[PDB]
Symmetry: C4
């Protein structure tokens, strides 16, 4: 079976910790959000969807394949499909974080354009990874597509053709980001959650 058990357990502890941190920020209320971490080139560790991310225990962490399918046999879910999609788009990514903050939810409902943009040299330093011809951090907003494979399709199309790879928003579902490490993903989450705060606060005088 190899040393998967070793890496899996490490990701379990990594995810439980990430969950306590997210919760302390008010970004994963009452079961919303989800967290995943790369176990190996064949398996991913992902938080069970109905569990509160702020009180995880080993039993709440599931092991799936790059097809979003649960190793112990099963059918993929929207969340499981969406994470694997991220892993496939960015081979360097080892962690995916989905938050569901009040600001993200609200922005998902009032933003008329299909993206949120800000331009913050200050915040760019959080994405030393991304090289682009712009200085504006951009966050694409995807529709609440009930058709999962199509939603995935649009996300792939966007990121395959876009220089910016900060994260994305799915209206009525929440924010998604990722990183080469859980630390990098959390940092990205914070950066984006910050933008959502400014974006709205602006639209409280506009």
């Amino acid at each position: 079976n190899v040393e998967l058990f070793k890496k899996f357990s490490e990701k379990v502890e990594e995810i439980i910790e990430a969950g306590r941190i997210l919760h302390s920020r008010g970004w994963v209320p009452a079961t919303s959000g989800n967290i995943s971490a790369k176990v190996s080139e064949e398996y991913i560790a992902i938080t069970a969807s109905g569990k509160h991310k702020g009180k995880l225990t080993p039993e709440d962490i599931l092991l799936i394949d790059y097809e979003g399918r649960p190793v112990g046999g099963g059918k993929p879910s929207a969340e499981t499909l969406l994470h694997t999609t991220v892993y496939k788009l960015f081979p360097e990514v080892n962690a995916v974080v989905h938050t569901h903050s009040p600001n993200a939810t609200v922005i998902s409902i009032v933003e008329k354009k299909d993206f949120v943009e800000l331009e913050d040299y200050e915040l760019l330093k959080a994405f030393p990874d991304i090289h682009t011809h712009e200085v504006k951090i951009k966050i694409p907003i995807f529709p609440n597509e009930q058709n999962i494979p199509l939603l995935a399709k649009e996300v792939e199309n966007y990121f395959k053709t876009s220089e910016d790879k900060y994260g994305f928003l799915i209206r009525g579902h929440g924010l998604y980001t990722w990183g080469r490490s859980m630390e990098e993903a959390l940092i990205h989450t914070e950066a984006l959650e910050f933008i959502f705060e400014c974006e709205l606060k602006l639209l409280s005088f506009h």
Copy 2:
């Protein structure tokens, strides 16, 4: 006397902890709110109304009957009647939480409709209990009925005939939720408090 003393003491510790958690969220300011836990099919443990939920001690926890009456003889109160009402409506419920957050209070005053609604698949996972023909989490708002038995009446009528059983709001009094366990009730409280946040924030641009 049986092992009531055993269960009572466990609920005391459960309630004091729930109170510290609620307070840390700013949901039980200066004595507002109240917490109750099922001791047995004949008794309920409830927080004394004039005590700060964030600094409870065993002496602040009262023992009442399913009639809202204080075991040591006494006359029921509005709060005591309202909780027992919840216990009677839902036999599976073992804990009731009443919060009084700034958002809930405000919503109690500005919402024109008699309910708050949102629709959040994400948040629905917090109510694995409820099965309905809708995807919108709904929260009924009841009037500041001075006539307690009538208020109770309306709450009973609503929930006896409604598929949704998330919680309810009493204008000028606060939010009410419940769960099969204190943990489940707290999680529900968070989910609903989240909706109140988005609801208002929306109405800051509408």
Copy 3:
């Protein structure tokens, strides 16, 4: 010299703790606010005005008389006069807390009427002391009177003739409350700070 030293030291520790609690709430930013505690019928312990209430040490606590004068000889200050005023109005009061929250400051500037009112049975339980013919918690707002003795005069007149004795606001200076114990004062502060939150939030849609 008696056992003043005993009581003084107890109030020192009481005040330092009250200060850490206030600061954690964001109610005493950068030196604003002040805290006082009754040492005896002849002396009061009060926090030095230029010290940050969230990092007090014994050296930051001053001992004054019921005349606001610093025992070691000196001339009274506005703050010292205002607290002694409170102590004189309410003989049962042993602690006075002055906070300076963003909400209080803002309310001090936008409220057109000379008082803030709310009516919250829920919050009334925080003032088991006050008996009145009303159900609305009321907070009088006094002008930024440069003439200290006149400001004091108006405060005395108000409370000598008013049934409500929750606390008061001095525009451009901050909120004031008190209690038979520091715990009671802090609880009152929270109750009033809560009202300031709702009051404004309302005026974000009105």
Copy 4:
């Protein structure tokens, strides 16, 4: 080499702590902001720009000269130039703090005038250092000048000719303050961040 190593290490620990405090306030999200401390009349310790101020370790602290140049040879940066500028303007200053809060960022975008003002006797006590003919705490706003030496020029001109020396804002970059000690700088930061809160909240009803 002298005892620089002694002082440097002390500033390292001072800066890491300041960073944890700033982060807990939500003022240095995802790498934004920066912190510096005077090591000697020839060297300054400054936080690396791309590191998260809330998770600093000795390796993230750089040593530069009063010319903003990195001792180990290198070319100055905007941040490094801006801090040294502050150190040169105020010889008593031993610490510089740059925050990047949601409020500061937002204010940087909506404030039409080139400064923010408030007038708060209460807050003035936080600046026992500054003597002026006014009672209003003033914060000058400088443009997002890509031309660094010119930005520096304007900042110097302002403070060389202004009685107020509370701090300043660079649109799209963040708030800057300083103090004779890190504690004094943090206190100033809080005072200014408070004003930004009130300023906006006002402009939510104006």
